[PDB]
Amino acid sequence: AITNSVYSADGWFSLHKLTKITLPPDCPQSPCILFFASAGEDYTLRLPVDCNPSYVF
Amino acid sequence: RGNNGNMTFNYYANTYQNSVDFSTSGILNPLGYLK
Amino acid sequence: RGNNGNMTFNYYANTYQNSVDFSTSGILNPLGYLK
Amino acid sequence: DRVTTQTAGNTAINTQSSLGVLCAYVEDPTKSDPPSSSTDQPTTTFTAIDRWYTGRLNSWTKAVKTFSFQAVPLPGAFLSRQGGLNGGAFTATLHRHFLMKCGWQVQVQCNLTQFHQGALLVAMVPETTLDVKEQWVEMSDDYRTGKNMPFQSLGTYYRPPNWTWGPNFINPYQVTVFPHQILNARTSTSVDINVPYIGETPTQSSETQNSWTLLVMVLVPLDYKEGATTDPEITFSVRPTSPYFNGLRNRYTT
């Protein structure tokens, strides 16, 4: 998203909690949801561009 | 057949019970035709 | 057949005695199924 | 096994303690026919309304007594948005049609724990006026007798009689004759009921009918030792199966 148009920004993912997490006594409060981000089986990429060399600075 | 629920048995004849004409020898049609 | 001990003879027709539906053209089953 | 997901349109609801769907009175209550009392072409199901609608219901506490119930009308909770139950394009289709004919399909979610006890009686109750004039309605002697059901006032001409009974009573011991499942705190976190269309006519008015009422009644009160999760929240999911909308007109104004 250079110019933040609909051709580059495709909306939002959001995680709500529907029902609250029920714990018994003697269990840790605030558990953690570990996120991942993979590609789908129909994911495709096109037009290789020049890199961002900012990792090496 | 009118308001008649009898399907079984007529005791009197059709000339006694009813009154039939003498001789001279569902699909509801329109009452007017455009010709 | 209800509370009817008549097995012999119905005098009136089934449309006069009873009231039948119009058309649009022992083994006691459960009243609830687990699916 | 007990892990079932029920897809309907763009909506899929999950449970891992499924007791099986309680189909009411027939094998497939989704099988329905167009009404014989309307000559226009009806509006059948389409993919924007063939879905589940999830609303909240009031929390269940220790203070809630036995037989204290809580009623959700169908489609009356879509009109008034009871429990945040916005009906989307189903209510938008319902306000524009004079008659409507559908069976329903409900799921009431309530997650307890293995340290909680108590039971809820989630039932689909035909033809009650339990939404008419707390968080929970108490089972008094007026509800058990139908003594408080709505009535036409006789006027000043008549001596006002001692009202003692009405046919829309609740016998709280016979609510398991209805299509019901019990939401025990030690068997399941949700229950499934599938009901067909019933009514005095082949199709009924959209704004007035209460042919089915979702009824959540407390059979055993909630109990837990302190430290456990207090006041678990009851929620419900409603899916209309085979609607036949009839009589298209403008959106409903009183």
Next chain:
Amino acid sequence: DRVTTQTAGNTAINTQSSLGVLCAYVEDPTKSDPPSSSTDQPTTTFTAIDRWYTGRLNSWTKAVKTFSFQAVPLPGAFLSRQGGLNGGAFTATLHRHFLMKCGWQVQVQCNLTQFHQGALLVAMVPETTLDVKEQWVEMSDDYRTGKNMPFQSLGTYYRPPNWTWGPNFINPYQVTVFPHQILNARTSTSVDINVPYIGETPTQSSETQNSWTLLVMVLVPLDYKEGATTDPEITFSVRPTSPYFNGLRNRYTT
């Protein structure tokens, strides 16, 4: 003959001076396919939106000059309700879907008499911005040149240039290249145009697109001897043919 009735849903519109439907660019412009740029299941046509929508348009007087036009965007007149054109369940479906893909079918009714003269050019014009900033828009030199079409201001950094042209001009002599019929005062009281979906993409956004604009232009001014009916009213009827709604979300808020 010249007496045709066009049924669409619960709507039938009549004319007894029909010139024949001007189908645009193809034999049947109603034949359309789902978009290839959306993987969700689209919302195709249904009987509550497969109908004609009749709006008024401003009256045509003697004071209205030659080439003085009047533009109706599609579906832009459904959003803003231009000319009392409430779109019903079509606009209610359009505010809830992100993309929409349909061809149109228009009929502009204007009954003159045998003692009136004048001509209107009713045309479906692709991709114009004639609704953007009287009863009738006058053909000035700004409209003939595209000089007054909307633009991004360059800011104070740049010297503001002399704007002299834009590609959304109106050449008023070449408006008969479009799908058009002339509403002559001595041949017909209404004209029919059927157009298919066109656009830069296989489907376009519901809130922004102006792929078709209904354009009613005065070619010959209205004239009549006094005693005749002054200022006959122009009305139009719009029918969406084969809509493919995509991207269901909540109702559109700015």
Next chain:
Amino acid sequence: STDNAETGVIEAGNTDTDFSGELAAPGSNHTNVKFLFDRSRLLNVIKVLEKDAVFPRPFPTATGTQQDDGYFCLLTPRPTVASRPATRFGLYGVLANTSLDFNFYSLACFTYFRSDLEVTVVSLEPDLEFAVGWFPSGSEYQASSFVYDQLHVPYHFTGRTPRAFASKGGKVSFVLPWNSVSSVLPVRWGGASKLSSATRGLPAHADWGTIYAFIPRPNEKKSTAVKHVAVYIRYKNARAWCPSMLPFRSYK
């Protein structure tokens, strides 16, 4: 046996399910809905018209309205009041005629009901020659009179509806069809009959009609003593739908 009641379905077991036993042989079938409801019972005791009536005006009725009360029997097992359908049932200004089918609702464990109605009208007066009119569900009572030889004869001696004339000391009995515009009778009802300003749970046309008894003499032969008559109804070919509750038997 090991079961789950939260299923919502519990199979009716026998002695041989857990214990050593057998099935009892099925003796009777008296719980048959078409059989169990096919018997007469006292519905209502109405009074006998000696002149033409004024049918009771709709609710709420104000004071001073000259109408005729206790004369019309609204043929329904549901609670009625003042010859009109009610929702609450009451008992004890004007004392309104209330009726309820006591035998029906103690076995109306269902939501919908439909039958043909067999009405029997038994006189509660010594040697009465009365006459029973009837007008269907959704119809209305014709309330005026015509003068035949200086005698006001009411319009409920005639009509296209049944008027059954009894002998002196005789009875009246005839079967009525399901004449209502509804497919079934709502034993319990949750809707409203109007869109605006309606009562919940009150069906409009859940009845087999309305009867009334009258004396087959003109209005000038009107007596002074009020004559009463009893209304018995039988449900012929009774069908029931959608299982429901039975009323709360109290413990006090």
